[PDB]
Symmetry: C3
Subunit: 132 residues, 3 copies
């Protein structure tokens, strides 16, 4: 009945193929124990309205970053970042939606690469707003 997670990447993610899940290595919060770091997946524990937000810093290489917020296998919302130079830029978006118990929410690295360090530029959080 109370759910809130906040996760960060503290090391770089540069997958060898397109459309890979963004796994996280650190949790700033995991109230309700709903977030699986190793899979990078939020497991919905109760039917309700949930809020999600993410900020992904891209690696400082001249290659764009595309990120999707996913519900199961569906793209919900997306973000783009590109510096037009070997520099960082940030891909961010948010969503509010009704979920059912068992729904999985996760972040997909469609294309590009993500910067991770102990300063936690690259973050992903969500919480239960209204139960039902």
């Amino acid at each position: 009945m109370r759910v809130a997670f906040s996760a960060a990447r503290t090391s770089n993610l540069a997958p060898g193929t397109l459309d890979q899940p963004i796994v996280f290595d650190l949790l700033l919060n995991n109230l309700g124990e709903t977030f699986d770091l190793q899979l990078g997946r939020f497991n919905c524990p109760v039917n309700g309205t949930y809020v999600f937000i993410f900020h992904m810093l891209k690696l400082a290489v001249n290659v764009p970053l595309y990120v999707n917020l996913m519900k199961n296998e569906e793209v919900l919302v997306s973000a783009y970042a590109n510096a037009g130079a070997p520099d960082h830029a940030t891909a961010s978006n948010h969503a509010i939606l009704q979920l059912f118990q068992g729904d999985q929410i996760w972040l997909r690295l469609h294309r590009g690469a993500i910067y991770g360090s102990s300063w936690k530029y690259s973050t992903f959080s969500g919480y239960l707003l209204y139960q039902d």
Copy 2:
């Protein structure tokens, strides 16, 4: 007593003049039925503290994007995006405020143009945090 909307643009918005409302074509959520897609307006149904957030991806043209979050006819907070090249960039901000029943919250495209597609880069959400 429970209010949450999340809207997206799935087609481009390139108004012919400055200071035009950002209309939305798709709702990811409309708990409480407070958001009018066609006008792009949130109609406050009850006095309370509300949270708003937006992410607007600009068209890939060398022209900056300025967006205002509006309360009735007043600029509340603003966002800027510019790539310095024919590339996308994202204008985002947020606000938390006390509203009265009948207040209207909406997004204004001050200058520039907004990218819309089925991948839903360009989003606008809000919700009731505390009733009163």
Copy 3:
């Protein structure tokens, strides 16, 4: 038991040294009276889960912007912005965490400079999600 602040900078901040606090001059909201504008500090009034978010627009000079969300003296999460030219760009991030009464949350300008005007590009908000 109900806490929500939203603050903005309406004038430029260009500190003479690294790692300075971002003070705010304007409050869009201060439900619970927890935010000290002059220090730019949120004073946690009750143990609970809190959400924070910020958007900082950098000055239009070719110098990057680094911002940290701080808990007492600890970096929680960070943001970067750079245009690669004399142009604005936005440093944003968010976090959800458990705090105790007496904890202080604030924004640190690690390096760079922040743009402030009446259009309120540069914002910082937080609220109590769950008391306990």
